[model samples]
Target: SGAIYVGNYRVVNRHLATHNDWANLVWEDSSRDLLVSSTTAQGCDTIARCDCQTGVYYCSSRRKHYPVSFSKPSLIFVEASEYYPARYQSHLMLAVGHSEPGDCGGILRCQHGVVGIVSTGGNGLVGFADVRDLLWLDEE
Candidate 1:
């Protein structure tokens, strides 16, 4: 698909010039919200810890998996990602069931090769599904 640039050039140039300084200033604080992380490829954990610590953070698979059940039984790897470092670190603990001990942050469960991510943050219920619902491969 051939796409050509459109819109006001001077406005674009002026907007870029006005915001360019802030872009390079790392010391300035930025939001660690999911939308920001998703857009910048900067995970929340990295943003939160970068200023406070030295060295870098890398993903590891050495943690234990905690058992949970939903429409199906599943396990949540404690340190699966920077988003989830420990079992009780945040108000949100991913698990099944209508309610749990703390606030009903959200749930992420897998069943039959499909994973479900569900959440509710003052706003209405939100969800995202991973993996194709159906698939087939040719025989070798």
Candidate 2:
């Protein structure tokens, strides 16, 4: 009964994480840019940084406050579905970071604790769709 607002799409997902682990969890994408999400507050932060080409990230978590790296190998975008027309353009939802949704990689394994929408290219070129309309490819 809720939705995440990002770009022009309204991503809706009832599933959410409960751990307040890390803030500004980030990682490198296919283009060597950083895709980041802020977790400073519970159920209030948004995936602010989509794909910052810069290698550094700013963290405001009380436990750790400094520029963090976003180059972990685990941070990747697994395609959720094939490209299709939506709202007069193509769109898809990519599962960012690790295999588990709403979480990041590395020792800390930061948890953003919410679902959001983002473009396909990991950059801002493409776009996303309503979470319910998104289709997951069958694992073979």
Candidate 3:
């Protein structure tokens, strides 16, 4: 344990900010994988996708960094906090690998189902939320 370091804050007189609204005005779209669906503004799949580690592929968003190695055999599930539903889904939320921010929202399918959607990344791993979080393809 260590000294508690409470961060700073400023409660505005009246709150009138909404992230949902901002994104709504923006109106755009968007998970996880060992089954990583790595596609960007530039299109193409990584080699099978890539080398011995998951390897020798491209992490290069703009260039083919052949040495960057997009190789990751298993996305070791680390933290868990996602489930697919539009405010009603329980998602696949965890899997860590040496992936990049460009790799976020890649599909992580298990058992022949669209289970998870990759979330953001940090340090060297990315996590997934769930398909139902956005898809809401309610189970029949």
> What's the TM-score of every candidate structure?
0.18, 0.19, 0.32
- Name the weakest run of 10 consecutive residues (lDDT summed) in model 2: 131-140
What is the Cα root-mean-square deviation between model 1 and the actual structure? 18.2
| Candidate 2 C-alpha lDDT tens digits along 22-58 | 2333221223211323333334324422332112211
True-structure RMSD, every candidate: 18.2, 15.2, 15.3
Ranking of models by lDDT: 3, 2, 1
What's model 1's lDDT at 105? 18
lDDT tens digits, residue span 40-135, model 1: 222111111111111111111212223343222122222222233333221122332232112221223323222322321222212121112112
Q: Among these predicted structures, which one has the highest lDDT? A: 3
Q: Model 3 over residues 1-140: C-alpha lDDT tens digits? A: 00100111111101121353333331122223211111123422111211222212223333432322122333243443342222221223433354555544344443233333344445654444433232212211
Model 2 residue 34 lDDT score: 17
Q: Give the Cα error of residue 124 in candidate 1, in Å.
A: 20
- In terms of TM-score, the best-performing candidate is 3
Report model 3's TM-score to 2 decimal places. 0.32
What is candidate 1's TM-score against the reference?
A: 0.18
Model 2 error, position 39 (Å): 16
Candidate achieving higher lDDT, 1 or 2: 2
